[PDB]
Amino acid sequence: HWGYGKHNGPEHWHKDFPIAKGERQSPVDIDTHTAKYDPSLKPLSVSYDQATSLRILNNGHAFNVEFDDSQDKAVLKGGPLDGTYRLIQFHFHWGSLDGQGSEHTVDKKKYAAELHLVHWNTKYGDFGKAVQQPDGLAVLGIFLKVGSAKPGLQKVVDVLDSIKTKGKSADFTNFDPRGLLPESLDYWTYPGSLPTPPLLESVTWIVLKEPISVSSEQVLKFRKLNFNGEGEPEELMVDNWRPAQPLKNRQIKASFK
Numbered sequence: 001h002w003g004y005g006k007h008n009g010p011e012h013w014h015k016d017f018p019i020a021k022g023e024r025q026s027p028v029d030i031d032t033h034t035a036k037y038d039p040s041l042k043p044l045s046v047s048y049d050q051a052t053s054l055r056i057l058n059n060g061h062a063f064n065v066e067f068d069d070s071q072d073k074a075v076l077k078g079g080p081l082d083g084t085y086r087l088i089q090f091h092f093h094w095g096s097l098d099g100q101g102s103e104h105t106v107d108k109k110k111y112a113a114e115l116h117l118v119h120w121n122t123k124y125g126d127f128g129k130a131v132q133q134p135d136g137l138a139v140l141g142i143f144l145k146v147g148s149a150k151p152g153l154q155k156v157v158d159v160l161d162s163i164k165t166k167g168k169s170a171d172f173t174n175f176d177p178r179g180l181l182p183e184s185l186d187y188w189t190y191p192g193s194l195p196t197p198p199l200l201e202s203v204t205w206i207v208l209k210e211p212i213s214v215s216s217e218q219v220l221k222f223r224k225l226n227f228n229g230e231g232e233p234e235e236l237m238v239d240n241w242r243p244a245q246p247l248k249n250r251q252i253k254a255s256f257k
């Protein structure tokens with residue numbers, strides 16, 4: 001149905017998902033002059049010590065590394081969050097060229113890619129009930145710039161050949177998401193939504209100030225994936241990002257001075 005092409009991309013999404021023109025849509029541009037530091041924020045807790053990855057897959061839009069969320073094994077607490085959010089999966093958004101690929105921007109500056117770690121409020125039982133509530137999801141966003149290779153990313157990059165096209169999957173165990181984080185946990189936060197259809201407005205966004213560096217070679221592996229299924233016309237999985245949306249009446253809060 002939907003995608004990132006000319007006839008099924010971000011400018012067509014409102015037709016099937018009218019909430020695309022809603023009040024708390026993501027992504028957004030982050031204006032550092034108006035993104036005020038918020039002294040009420042508590043420190044963010046990233047607890048990935050017992051994360052249990054299950055698999056990696058191509059869903060026709062991106063690749064998703066899935067995790068066992070049946071217990072508190074990889075969770076996010078603190079920050080602006082009320083309670084505990086379990087990591088269910090992570091995936092990236094990237095461009096054709098280094099010059100673009102991120103969803104969020106900082107003072108209009110676009111990064112080569114953006115990692116998203118998706119988490120759901122255990123108040124709700126499972127992902128399914130959680131995605132429909134305003135306080136239902138917590139996505140940790142992390143920008144990627146091009147430079148030194150990211151060692152923790154290599155395990156992912158080395159299995160992408162196995163999931164080239166939509167519908168493919170493969171066993172993917174013992175992957176450690178702590179290996180994808182930058183040094184600082186400095187972040188901006190605002191109430192948003194899923195950047196992909198159904199675009200439900202149920203996500204508390206936490207975007208880290210410090211990008212990670214990944215090598216031109218790792219990102220180049222990303223680019224060889226396809227949006228299409230085996231046997232269909234070969235469509236390179238590139239530019240799977242939605243551009244910035246109006247901030248509207250929202251405020252972006254900084255965890256740092």
Ligand SMILES: [Zn+2]
Nearest residue numbers: 092093116195
């Ligand atoms: Zn995403």
